[PDB]
Design a protein around this nucleic acid. Structure first.
Ligand SMILES: [Mg+2]
Ligand SMILES: [Mg+2]
Ligand SMILES: [Mg+2]
Ligand SMILES: [Mg+2]
Ligand SMILES: [Mg+2]
Ligand SMILES: [Mg+2]
Ligand SMILES: [Mg+2]
Ligand SMILES: [Mg+2]
Ligand SMILES: [Mg+2]
Ligand SMILES: [Mg+2]
Ligand SMILES: [Mg+2]
Ligand SMILES: [Mg+2]
Ligand SMILES: [Mg+2]
Ligand SMILES: [Mg+2]
Ligand SMILES: [Mg+2]
Ligand SMILES: [Mg+2]
Ligand SMILES: [Mg+2]
Ligand SMILES: [Mg+2]
Ligand SMILES: [Mg+2]
Ligand SMILES: [Mg+2]
Ligand SMILES: [Mg+2]
Ligand SMILES: [Mg+2]
Ligand SMILES: [Mg+2]
Ligand SMILES: [Mg+2]
Ligand SMILES: [Mg+2]
Ligand SMILES: [Mg+2]
Ligand SMILES: [Mg+2]
Ligand SMILES: [Mg+2]
Ligand SMILES: [Mg+2]
Ligand SMILES: [Mg+2]
Ligand SMILES: [Mg+2]
Ligand SMILES: [Mg+2]
Ligand SMILES: [Mg+2]
Ligand SMILES: [Mg+2]
Ligand SMILES: [Mg+2]
Ligand SMILES: [Mg+2]
Ligand SMILES: [Mg+2]
Ligand SMILES: [Mg+2]
Ligand SMILES: [Mg+2]
Ligand SMILES: [Mg+2]
Ligand SMILES: [Mg+2]
Ligand SMILES: [Mg+2]
Ligand SMILES: [Mg+2]
Ligand SMILES: [Mg+2]
Ligand SMILES: [Mg+2]
Ligand SMILES: [Mg+2]
Ligand SMILES: [Mg+2]
Ligand SMILES: [Mg+2]
Ligand SMILES: [Mg+2]
Ligand SMILES: [Mg+2]
Ligand SMILES: [Mg+2]
Ligand SMILES: [Mg+2]
Ligand SMILES: [Mg+2]
Ligand SMILES: [Mg+2]
Ligand SMILES: [Mg+2]
Ligand SMILES: [Mg+2]
Ligand SMILES: [Mg+2]
Ligand SMILES: [Mg+2]
Ligand SMILES: [Mg+2]
Ligand SMILES: [Mg+2]
Ligand SMILES: [Mg+2]
Ligand SMILES: [Mg+2]
Ligand SMILES: [Mg+2]
Ligand SMILES: [Mg+2]
Ligand SMILES: [Mg+2]
Ligand SMILES: [Mg+2]
Ligand SMILES: [Mg+2]
Ligand SMILES: [Mg+2]
Ligand SMILES: [Mg+2]
Ligand SMILES: [Mg+2]
Ligand SMILES: [Mg+2]
Ligand SMILES: [Mg+2]
Ligand SMILES: [Mg+2]
Ligand SMILES: [Mg+2]
Ligand SMILES: [Mg+2]
Ligand SMILES: [Mg+2]
Ligand SMILES: [Mg+2]
Ligand SMILES: [Mg+2]
Ligand SMILES: [Mg+2]
Ligand SMILES: [Mg+2]
Ligand SMILES: [Mg+2]
Ligand SMILES: [Mg+2]
Ligand SMILES: [Mg+2]
Ligand SMILES: [Mg+2]
Ligand SMILES: [Mg+2]
Ligand SMILES: [Mg+2]
Ligand SMILES: [Mg+2]
Ligand SMILES: [Mg+2]
Ligand SMILES: [Mg+2]
Ligand SMILES: [Mg+2]
Ligand SMILES: [Mg+2]
Ligand SMILES: [Mg+2]
Ligand SMILES: [Mg+2]
Ligand SMILES: [Mg+2]
Ligand SMILES: [Mg+2]
Ligand SMILES: [Mg+2]
Ligand SMILES: [Mg+2]
Ligand SMILES: [Mg+2]
Ligand SMILES: [Zn+2]
Lengths: 126, 206, 70, 50, 119, 87
RNA sequence: AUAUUGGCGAGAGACCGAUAGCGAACAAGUACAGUGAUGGAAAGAUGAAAAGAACUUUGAAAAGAGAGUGAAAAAGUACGUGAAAUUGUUGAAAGGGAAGGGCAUUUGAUCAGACA
RNA sequence: CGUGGAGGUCAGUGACGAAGCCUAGACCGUAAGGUCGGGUCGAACGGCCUCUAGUGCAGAUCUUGGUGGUAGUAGCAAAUAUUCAAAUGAGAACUUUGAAGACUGAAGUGGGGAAAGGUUCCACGUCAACAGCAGUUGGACGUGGGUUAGUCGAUCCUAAGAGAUGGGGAAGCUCCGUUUCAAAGGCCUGAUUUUAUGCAGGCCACCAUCGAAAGGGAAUCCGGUUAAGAUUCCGGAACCUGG
RNA sequence: AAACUUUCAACAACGGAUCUCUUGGUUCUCGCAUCGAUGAAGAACGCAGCGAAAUGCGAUACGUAAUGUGAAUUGCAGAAUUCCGUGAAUCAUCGAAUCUUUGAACGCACAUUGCGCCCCUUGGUAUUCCAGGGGGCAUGCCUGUUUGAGCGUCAUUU
């Protein structure tokens, strides 16, 4: 149960803020959970997905496949992996859009800033 | 109060082979010529527009209020009522079910559930939980999306943690004896709520 | 293009806010060139055309593919 | 009309520029919703009223 | 590319003017090229570069004036605080707090006392 | 002849474009605008015309300056600059 | 302490659910009418994903026929469901200046139940 | 009896198919209606106690939308008129070129303009809609190109008239007045040889401004040139105004 | 006997009801006090690599500067140096700017991109004419400065 006077349970308002969320706001909404191994490694559950990260699909038809996030397609609330695609009938190839909540992060791309994030959440890093 | 009425539309009088509701004037848009205002008109004002000064609340004599909650309390004894009301008390130790004042001091949900279970509420707790459904209404999109039954009502004399250790368990409610509310004692006006009384609360009753 | 090859005339779209003096001076300063006379018109899209005739010392064709077009 | 003021001509210019089909690439944008240009005017269907 | 301000502010006044003229020559050329070409995005960046340089020339000229007016009655209106028309009329703290000699005495002698009930 | 033969003589404007409101209700001979009142210092409007008002009130345009007053109010009409921080 | 169908920020409803709710859920005070004051609409929904039909064949083309994609084309940018009026084809029947209806049975078609 | 929402309950139904829709198949009810099967369908929904109302349609020359019979019907008949052949094209009564027959008959169906329109002009592409047959054509559709002035107009002037200002009315939006009951303004040079422009004469008291693309008015012509501009470009030869 | 008409059903039309949706509306409640001559509200016209609109912006034109974030934007193209970084972004925030022509709208006009005056400066052999660049000149009223008017009026000259 909410308890504060400044959070709204309202469904209309919630859908509205989702679908019209600004780019910066979607980076955080698009988080992926870490892998069992990465979670022990860094003592941390999840992180906003970020491009050159390495990732395992764990729901849906692509369950079990893996690769590198090639773009975080924030406009579409979706992520693309160079290694997970549709081959069309005309032989042309086309990315498939995946949701971070359906991935698992198996290798992080690290910055000063990424490390600084993991630390701010009280994690530990190899 | 202005809907249906944001036109300058006029009747056309008779002699024009056409019903005499007012009609929007002007030309060139498809709206013009059309029935206006009346309640049978697309875009008309409704019959008897609802008004905020409708009566919403209701006065009840304080003493009758009390008669009712007194009756309701009396019925939380009387197993068959409690049974009839839903409520899975077919194997609780006894009724009224009174429990140690130590309950009011539990801070932790998991301990709180443990205790309710021990004293016999396992099956009512399970009934809520087994009963979540999407509501059949349009209610479903007016902040009223799910449905579920009512669990036991835990009553205490002093909140020393219990109202907070219980607030997250589905269907379980808590009340101070000093208050005590008819909406909870007889949900939907059906006598019989399963009530678990702390001793401290059971004796404050008199 | 033809006016350039045949009439020693550079043709510019030019600011609405500018007059025959300002166009002349501008072309001169920007192009090291000498202007005989400047005709102008307002296009049917809200822009100004300047027919700029250079003096006979200059060769507008030459001077147009020095600025870099064709 | 035919010996005009700059004001009318300025307006006519804006009018000529707004007179064209949808730029077709727009049709392909994510969540695009515009089929065609619904504000297309024509000199012999609707008058400008200056 | 595109110029950065924080590098522009380390340049002399006359360097910045000169880079302005350089960019403008360049923009001029890009525009010649643009019409021999299916597409020409780089033009965008040179014209945002001009924007930047002008901003930085204006910045400097302004804080130059701002400072040689800092600390005098009367400075040009477009360096005066904006606030709001009302706020900008509006008694100053000083004027608002003006109190009569008779008031002042009364305030001194008989101020609101801190007190409490019990005994 | 009061109908269509006479509609053929309609080729002269009673109103042109109004400088202040753009509308083509600037009555030429009267030299005043039937919509916004130009060149009256004030703007035409009437309480018996709520639609017209709504067609023209503040917010139906860009609000080029007023847009920003509430942010500026919110932060107490700040002056100066933001400083700096880290990572 | 009082007011508040305006403004900015918020939390809500035994409220409406696209002919309803504000006129406007959409490039709506738009498009469009009027010399002018003013008047003022219609218009939401493929699918999880365009995977928006490669390729063959007939055709001047639009398209058709195959193929293909898809959980489904009985979802094909005419797109969820897809009523009625009204229409085409197929099948069955009746019909000497209307048709339709009531009680009853023949004839045809069709079907439940119950036997053990 | 039935409908939208509400409290309770049946730990009710459901992607192994909710709701909805179809169905001279079944069953219950005197009836309002209720139940089933089958087909279609795709995400939600119902029984019972109770609460609540924007709660039940055949009508209102009802409202909005859709749809028929009428009916392949009335009709597509004013303005004298069309024809042969080639070419192009999937396709030619209707496009293009040739031929022929005619018409308008300079009070024009010719050659230009004002108002109005606003790109319709011109070129290339080209037919889904539109041009009440057609269409390869178009004032349509797509993409482009195109309007050049010291001398042509505007701009200047004044006309009927409009309309600020000192003022006078009016609660006021504003109304009156226009030289009016006003301390209403600027030119010509001299005086400067600190110096740039203060004073020395004398005048002139005319006291706004808007209002004509037909009235008044400084000044340009011929020849050539474009797909589309031309008294505007090019060639030549002039003229006016200011300095 | 067909055709035709009429009834039923099946598949196909026509049409868009119904069911289920809902970033809209409607009503209630709580908190707050900020438009404008420092040029508001409103208008016009413009501005993107490829936009007609809506949204945004003003010749610095779907943006400049600053700050926070920490790698996108995405219809296509693009840059490529921007990824352990004074640093991506149609991001958030916003304190500094730019802000065409207008509008109470202010040199005069305005169905005109019409017509003056003043100052500084540049160019044309120029205090005087022309052209370019910058900066100015509305009205009422208040305090003050300066210059003045009137036998309205005081004193003081010889
Ligand atoms: Mg918190
Ligand atoms: Mg986090
Ligand atoms: Mg997704
Ligand atoms: Mg009313
Ligand atoms: Mg009738
Ligand atoms: Mg209504
Ligand atoms: Mg329902
Ligand atoms: Mg339920
Ligand atoms: Mg009490
Ligand atoms: Mg040559
Ligand atoms: Mg000209
Ligand atoms: Mg017409
Ligand atoms: Mg019309
Ligand atoms: Mg940048
Ligand atoms: Mg001030
Ligand atoms: Mg009459
Ligand atoms: Mg008429
Ligand atoms: Mg008139
Ligand atoms: Mg008047
Ligand atoms: Mg005015
Ligand atoms: Mg309110
Ligand atoms: Mg509340
Ligand atoms: Mg509506
Ligand atoms: Mg209703
Ligand atoms: Mg409506
Ligand atoms: Mg919506
Ligand atoms: Mg429309
Ligand atoms: Mg749908
Ligand atoms: Mg639909
Ligand atoms: Mg969709
Ligand atoms: Mg096919
Ligand atoms: Mg299906
Ligand atoms: Mg379907
Ligand atoms: Mg298709
Ligand atoms: Mg369908
Ligand atoms: Mg019968
Ligand atoms: Mg019978
Ligand atoms: Mg009932
Ligand atoms: Mg009901
Ligand atoms: Mg209702
Ligand atoms: Mg079903
Ligand atoms: Mg039937
Ligand atoms: Mg049965
Ligand atoms: Mg079935
Ligand atoms: Mg679905
Ligand atoms: Mg009831
Ligand atoms: Mg009703
Ligand atoms: Mg009835
Ligand atoms: Mg009916
Ligand atoms: Mg009837
Ligand atoms: Mg009746
Ligand atoms: Mg009817
Ligand atoms: Mg009808
Ligand atoms: Mg026919
Ligand atoms: Mg016939
Ligand atoms: Mg006839
Ligand atoms: Mg013919
Ligand atoms: Mg003849
Ligand atoms: Mg004759
Ligand atoms: Mg003719
Ligand atoms: Mg002509
Ligand atoms: Mg026209
Ligand atoms: Mg033509
Ligand atoms: Mg065709
Ligand atoms: Mg046509
Ligand atoms: Mg036709
Ligand atoms: Mg045809
Ligand atoms: Mg065209
Ligand atoms: Mg064109
Ligand atoms: Mg002349
Ligand atoms: Mg002039
Ligand atoms: Mg007057
Ligand atoms: Mg005049
Ligand atoms: Mg004249
Ligand atoms: Mg004349
Ligand atoms: Mg000639
Ligand atoms: Mg030419
Ligand atoms: Mg011609
Ligand atoms: Mg000549
Ligand atoms: Mg000569
Ligand atoms: Mg001379
Ligand atoms: Mg026979
Ligand atoms: Mg069927
Ligand atoms: Mg519905
Ligand atoms: Mg949905
Ligand atoms: Mg709401
Ligand atoms: Mg509240
Ligand atoms: Mg206004
Ligand atoms: Mg945009
Ligand atoms: Mg871009
Ligand atoms: Mg930084
Ligand atoms: Mg932003
Ligand atoms: Mg600027
Ligand atoms: Mg003025
Ligand atoms: Mg001007
Ligand atoms: Mg100036
Ligand atoms: Mg004074
Ligand atoms: Mg004095
Ligand atoms: Zn106006």
């Amino acid at each position: 149960a909410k308890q504060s006077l400044d959070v709204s349970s309202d469904r209309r308002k919630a859908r509205k803020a989702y679908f019209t969320a600004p780019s910066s706001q979607r980076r955080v909404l698009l988080s992926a959970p870490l892998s069992k191994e990465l979670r022990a490694q860094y003592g941390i559950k999840a992180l906003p997905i970020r491009r050159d990260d390495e990732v395992l699909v764990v729901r849906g038809s692509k369950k079990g496949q893996e690769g590198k996030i090639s773009s975080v397609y924030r406009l579409k609330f979706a992520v693309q992996v160079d290694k997970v695609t549709k081959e069309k009938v005309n032989g042309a190839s086309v990315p498939i859009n995946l949701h971070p909540s359906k991935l698992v992060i198996t290798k992080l791309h690290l910055d000063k800033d990424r490390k600084a994030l993991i630390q701010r959440k009280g994690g530990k890093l190899e | 109060e202005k809907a249906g009425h944001q036109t300058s539309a006029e009747s056309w009088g008779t002699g024009r082979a056409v019903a005499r509701i007012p009609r929007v004037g002007g030309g060139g848009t498809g709206r013009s010529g059309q029935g206006a205002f009346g309640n049978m008109c697309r875009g008309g004002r409704m019959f008897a527009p609802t008004k905020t000064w409708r009566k919403w609340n209701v006065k009840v004599n304080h003493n009758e209020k009390r008669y009712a909650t007194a009756s309701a309390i009396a019925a939380t004894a009387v197993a068959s009522l409690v049974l009839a009301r839903g409520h899975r008390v077919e194997k609780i130790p006894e009724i009224p079910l009174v429990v140690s004042t130590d309950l009011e001091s539990i801070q932790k949900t998991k301990e709180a559930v443990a205790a309710l279970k021990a004293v016999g509420a396992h099956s009512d707790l399970l009934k809520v939980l087994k009963s979540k459904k999407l509501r059949a209404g349009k209610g479903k999109y007016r902040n009223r999306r799910w449905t579920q039954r009512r669990g036991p009502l835990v009553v205490y004399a002093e909140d020393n943690g219990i109202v907070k250790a219980l607030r997250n368990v589905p269907g379980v409610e808590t009340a101070n004896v000093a208050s005590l509310n008819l909406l909870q004692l007889a949900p939907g006006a059906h006598l019989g709520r399963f009530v678990i009384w702390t001793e401290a609360a059971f004796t404050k009753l008199d | 293009m033809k006016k350039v090859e045949d009439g020693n005339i550079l043709v510019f779209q030019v600011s609405m806010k500018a007059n025959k003096y300002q166009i002349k001076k501008a072309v001169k300063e920007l192009y090291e060139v000498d202007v005989l006379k400047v005709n102008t018109l307002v296009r049917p899209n809200g822009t100004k055309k300047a027919y700029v005739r250079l003096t006979a010392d200059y060769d507008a064709l030459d001077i147009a593919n020095r600025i870099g077009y064709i | 009309a035919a010996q005009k003021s700059f004001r009318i001509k300025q307006k006519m210019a804006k009018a000529k520029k707004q007179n064209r089909p949808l730029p077709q690439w727009i049709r392909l944008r994510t969540n695009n919703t515009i089929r065609y240009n619904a504000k297309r005017r024509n000199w012999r269907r609707t008058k400008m009223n200056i | 590319a595109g110029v950065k301000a924080y590098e522009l502010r380390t340049k002399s006044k006359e360097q910045l003017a000169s880079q302005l003229v350089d960019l403008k020559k360049e923009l001029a050329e890009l525009k010649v090229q643009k019409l021999s070409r299916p597409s020409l995005p780089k033009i965008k960046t040179v014209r945002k570069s001009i924007a930047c340089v002008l901003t930085v020339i204006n910045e400097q000229q302004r804080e130059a004036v701002r400072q040689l007016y800092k600390g005098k009655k009367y400075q040009p209106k477009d360096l005066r605080a904006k606030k709001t028309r009302a706020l900008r009329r509006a008694l100053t703290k000083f004027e608002a707090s003006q109190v009569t000699e008779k008031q002042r005495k009364k305030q001194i002698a008989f101020p609101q006392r801190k007190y409490a009930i019990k005994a | 002849g009061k109908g269509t033969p006479s509609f053929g003589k309609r080729h002269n404007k009673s109103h042109t474009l109004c400088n202040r409101c753009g509308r083509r209700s600037f009555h030429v001979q009267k030299k005043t605008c039937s919509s916004c009142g130009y060149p009256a210092a004030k703007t035409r409007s009437y309480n018996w015309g709520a639609k017209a008002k709504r067609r023209h009130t503040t917010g139906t345009g860009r609000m080029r300056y007023l847009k920003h007053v509430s942010r500026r109010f919110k932060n107490g009409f700040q002056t100066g600059s933001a400083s700096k921080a880290s990572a």
